[PDB]
Amino acid sequence: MSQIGSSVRQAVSDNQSAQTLVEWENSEANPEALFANWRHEFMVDSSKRESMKTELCKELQALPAQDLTLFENEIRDENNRALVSGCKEELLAQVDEHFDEQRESMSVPGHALKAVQSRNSFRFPDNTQKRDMSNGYMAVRGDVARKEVVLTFDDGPHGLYTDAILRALKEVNAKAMFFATGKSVRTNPEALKRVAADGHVIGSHSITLTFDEAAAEVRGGHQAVFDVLGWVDPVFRFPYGETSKDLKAFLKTKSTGEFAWNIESDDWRTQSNEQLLARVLANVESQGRGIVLFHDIQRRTAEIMPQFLRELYNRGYSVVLLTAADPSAKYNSKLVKRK
Ligand SMILES: [Mg+2]
Ligand SMILES: [Zn+2]
Secondary structure (H helix, E strand, O other): OHHHHHHHHHHHHHHHHOOOHHHHHOOOOOHHHHHHHHHHHHHHOHHHHHHHHHHHHHHHHOOOHHHHHHHHHHHHOHHHHHHHOOOHHHHHHHHHHHHHHHHHOOOOOOOOOOOOOOOOOOOOOOOEEEEOOEOEOEEOOOOOOOOEEEEEEEOOOOOOHHHHHHHHHHHOOOOOEEEEOHHHHHHOHHHHHHHHHOOOEEEEEOOOOOHHHHHHHHHHHHHHHHHHHOOOOOEEEOOOOOOOHHHHHHHHHOOOEEEOOOEEOOOOOOOOHHHHHHHHHHHHHHHOOEEEEEEOOOHHHHHHHHHHHHHHHHOOOEEOEEEEOOOOHHHOOOOOOOO
């Protein structure tokens, strides 16, 4: 199996050795990238298909279940159906059994795959705060008060996990900001509509360039949201670590807020549910307030969301939604083409 096995082991290794999100973003063995390349190889040489399948299955089946979670989204992705058809059910049983075991030790269990009403029976107060985005806006902590946090979710919607996150938020009257990506929106428009219907803010996150190529990436995610909903909030998040002064100026000209964050979840890193809750809550406490970075495409984030929300409440934190001061801004984005 050596090249496929080497790449599988490399994904796991790089995920553990990365010190930051940006470093992990720099990996050459990101599972999404690995499977995009395998789909291409599979397409272009039919003589290699059966051996790719047997090898991929053997190498993924060799992983400990917790490590296998790194590849879960690729295994679930119907685009990869032919690659994993030989072992999909078995792999997903291993991952599902892992999250079953993880759930046992939680006082407020969640479930990313099915609709569960958690044990949460509290309600965060409404707390929506307006920001003038007409000549842009740079958010790090978002100008919120002590013990206020803004929950933000990148790269969705996912076909399953986002709805679990929505259920968790709704149960406790929490609102959030979603920075959707074009690819996810095109795959899952009905899920995006459910996010919209639950009162959340929805902007975009680009994913990869010359200035014009980068600007086109900024427009494209915004356009995808707009094409589904008839609006897109004037909020945008760069590809992590982007420093371009030109793109920052562009956003201001285009009356769109630029959202960074100050509270890391590290939810990109394979880890136990326990570890993830500990890291994100330690960072909430360390910072005291601000903007939290989650990914609604990360299963484990959906699994821990009810528990996370209960701990925010227990710890005296309140959830804030940031939104444009101009309620019409979402219908008149300078990043989208009408009609
Ligand atoms: Mg505004
Ligand atoms: Zn992202």
